[PDB]
Design a protein around this ligand. Structure first.
Ligand code: ZN
Ligand code: ZN
Lengths: 112, 217, 214, 56, 43, 116
């Protein structure tokens, strides 16, 4: 579900999923971004298994991501056949800056 | 239980024996006081074979003629992991050498333990008048103030098989069963220190004892 | 010797808990001596005929360089294990003057059963020397390893000042931890010291509270 | 309807038969006690369990 | 305390270092609407 | 334990140690009455008890209309009709074993199979 490898075939990405899907095989810096994202996901998995020892997946959290995904799919009419305009670096950087935009405390010191 | 010994039923039985407070009141059928004039042969015909090994093993010239016999229950030797030797040595070390104790073997048809109070060499013209009452007082503190095994404030321990979720080596979460000891009564400081358990996972219904033992957080 | 093995296991677990305590306080205790096994424990700290001795069990520890950088006000620590069950006035006096002559600011006395009140009254000694008495039965199991006990980290003076400044707090407005709490005794907290408590949160994953020692 | 009421009556009757069998075992002292509870408490637990599962 | 004392001008946090949320709260919105409507109802 | 009373003042007797014979003799504390003990047992205390379970059996126990009747076989006189009741001791841990009283010969017989 998560590992994307641009240098192998066991976890390769299908070129039909995105416009720049053929020329990204064998890339290095994009593979660096994927390795960083997958390492962060593995660390998240380990942290979640540390926090929830019983491995319960359903927990109360603020923003329903699934509803927003479905609203975007139905608003822009995702046909799930046309290749996507998204580049992978744009996806990774967008998720990262979204994480930096989730502000609960607005202080400008190390403790806050 | 210890995480490497979680599914061991007999090890959980050993822990249950190690933590449950068992006294002589839970094991003894009856307590009787007899008069045996000499500490060589008994006057009771049923324990003639019991005395004639232990008396021949051995002192007796300074022993009181009063005898304290306790008859125990066979089923109490079965539900509780107890034998005659453990009870005998516990009673011996509680009363030191002031009370000479012998016991029947575990294969005997009657579970009889016999006790005699050793007399001093000084002349006592009035102690023998109340010697029966003194032996009754010894028998009173014998029944409930002697703990055969386990830690205090533990009424009884029952044994459940709960179903915890453990990460499988393939990555999934599997419903691995575990033998867990539920307890009535709280002695959390003492129960945590016994071996064979996991002291990092012990939980108590009384959160007051958690704060006193583990901490405010 | 059945009881002696049980006491030897208790003493070995207490020694491991003491080593973990000293390592968590910031002093230099290496990892291989923390998990010293029972067979190597009996090979060193037990005599020929079997009784474990406690005089050579007593040891000395020094703070790490990181702990000097964070706390540049403490030096060595002395941990003593007692032999007699009831500690008299004379043994306590020899312990505190041995601390005095070797210039120890902290001394951990691990007694067996009890401290006599005639020796307990002089446990407060000349500043900055501090004496902490621990019972061996309370140290068989390390409480910090329990799943309910979260991570307690003692804050420095500058960290405490920054914490009070950024939240605009006074000392009394912080959550409190008493100076008899088992984790407070484990960390050796003095009055007015703040611990950052990092715990698991089911709503935000990680949560950092703070508690001042009263 | 009638077949369902007959089946319900049969269920209640077979639960009463099980309760009677447990009662005969207890009155013959052939019923073992569950751990942590007496003979009468175990008998009452078995009877209540049988009647509750009958009602269900 | 440590950063502010009594009722000096240090009570007023300057605009460049305001750490509160830039969003109007529901209580702030309710009281602003109430105060403005009360003023408008009094000409 | 068979408590024994003095034959003169009707007060209970107590065991005495004597060094003349070293025997068990019961002594009256009131009028100095001496008699010879028929048993060495001077004190008995049962923690589990088997007496009192058949308490209340009288010559007209079958006249009680509330007592249930059974059809069990009396193993003394072979009579089907009899009354029965549970153990009359009110301990919490007592068993539910039935005691049957035959109404023809007043014989007590239990339903206990562990004993039999
Ligand atoms: Zn008389
Ligand atoms: Zn009959």
């Amino acid at each position: 579900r998560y590992r994307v490898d641009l240098l192998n075939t066991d976890h390769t990405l299908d070129p039909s999923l995105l416009e720049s899907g053929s020329e990204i095989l064998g890339d290095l810096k994009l593979q660096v971004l994927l390795d960083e994202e997958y390492k962060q996901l593995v660390k998240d998995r380990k942290f979640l298994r540390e926090v929830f020892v019983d491995g319960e997946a359903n927990w109360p959290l603020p923003v329903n991501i699934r509803r927003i995904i479905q609203n975007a799919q139905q608003t822009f009419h995702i046909d799930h056949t046309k290749p996507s305009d998204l580049t992978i670096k744009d996806i990774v950087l967008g998720v990262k800056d979204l994480q930096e935009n989730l502000l609960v405390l607005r202080g400008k010191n190390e403790i806050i | 239980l210890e995480p490497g010994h979680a599914a061991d039923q007999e090890q959980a039985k050993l822990i249950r024996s190690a933590i449950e407070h068992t006294t002589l009141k839970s094991v003894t059928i009856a307590s009787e006081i007899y008069y045996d004039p000499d500490p060589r042969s008994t006057v009771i015909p049923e324990d003639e074979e019991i005395i004639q090994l232990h008396f021949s093993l051995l002192s007796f010239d300074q022993q009181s003629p009063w005898l304290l016999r306790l008859e125990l229950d066979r089923a109490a030797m079965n539900d509780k992991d107890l034998t005659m030797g453990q009870v005998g040595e516990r009673i011996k070390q509680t009363f030191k050498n002031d009370l000479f104790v012998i016991w029947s073997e575990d294969n005997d048809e009657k579970l009889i333990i016999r006790c005699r109070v050793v007399r001093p060499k000084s002349l006592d013209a009035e102690t023998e008048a109340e010697e029966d009452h003194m032996l009754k007082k010894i028998e009173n503190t014998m029944l409930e103030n002697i703990t055969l095994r386990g830690v205090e404030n533990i009424e009884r321990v029952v044994m459940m098989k709960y179903d915890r979720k453990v990460p499988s080596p393939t990555g999934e979460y599997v419903k691995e069963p575990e033998w867990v000891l539920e307890t009535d009564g709280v002695n959390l400081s003492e129960v945590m220190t016994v071996p064979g358990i996991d002291p990092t996972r012990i939980y108590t219904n009384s959160f007051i004892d958690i704060m006193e033992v583990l901490g405010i957080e | 010797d059945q009881e002696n093995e049980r006491n030897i296991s208790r003493l070995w677990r207490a020694f491991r808990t003491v080593k973990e305590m000293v390592k968590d306080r910031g002093y230099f205790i290496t990892q291989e001596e923390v998990e010293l096994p029972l067979e190597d424990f009996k090979a060193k700290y037990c005599d020929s005929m079997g009784r474990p001795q406690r005089k050579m069990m007593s040891f000395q520890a020094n703070p790490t360089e990181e702990s000097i950088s964070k706390f540049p006000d403490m030096g060595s620590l002395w941990v003593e294990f007692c032999d007699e069950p009831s500690v008299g006035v004379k043994t306590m006096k020899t312990f505190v003057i041995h601390i005095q002559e070797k210039n120890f600011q902290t001394g951990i006395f691990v007694y067996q059963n009890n401290i006599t009140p005639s020796a307990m009254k002089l446990v407060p000694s000349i500043p900055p020397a501090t004496i902490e008495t621990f019972n061996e039965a309370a140290l068989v199991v390390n409480i910090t390893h329990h799943e309910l006990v979260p991570k307690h980290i003692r804050l420095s003076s500058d960290e405490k000042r920054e914490l009070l400044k950024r939240y605009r707090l006074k000392e009394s407005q912080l959550p409190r931890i008493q100076r008899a709490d088992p984790v407070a005794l484990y960390l050796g907290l003095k009055r007015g010291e703040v611990v950052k408590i990092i715990r698991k949160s089911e709503t935000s994953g990680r949560y950092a509270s703070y508690r001042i020692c009263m | 309807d009638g077949p369902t009421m007959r089946e319900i009556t049969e269920t209640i009757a077979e639960a009463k038969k099980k309760v009677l069998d447990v009662t005969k075992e207890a009155q013959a002292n052939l019923l073992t006690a569950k751990h942590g509870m007496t003979l009468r408490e175990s008998f009452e637990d078995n009877v209540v369990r049988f009647l509750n599962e009958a009602r269900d | 305390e440590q950063i502010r004392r009594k009722t000096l001008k240090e009570k007023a946090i300057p605009k460049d270092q305001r750490a509160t949320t830039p969003y109007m709260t529901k209580y702030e919105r309710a009281r602003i609407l109430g105060t403005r409507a009360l003023q408008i109802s009094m000409n | 334990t068979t408590f024994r009373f003095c034959r003169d003042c009707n007060n209970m007797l107590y065991p005495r140690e004597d060094k003349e014979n070293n025997r068990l003799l019961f002594e009256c504390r009131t009028c100095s009455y001496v008699e010879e003990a028929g048993s060495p047992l001077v004190y008995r205390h049962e923690l589990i008890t088997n007496i009192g379970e058949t308490a209340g059996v009288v010559q007209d126990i079958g006249s009680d209309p509330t007592l249930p009747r059974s059809d069990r076989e009396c193993p003394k006189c072979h009579s089907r009709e009899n009354v029965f009741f549970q153990s009359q001791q009110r301990r919490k841990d007592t068993s539910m074993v039935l005691f049957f009283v035959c109404l023809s010969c007043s014989h007590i017989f239990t339903s206990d199979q562990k004993n039999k």
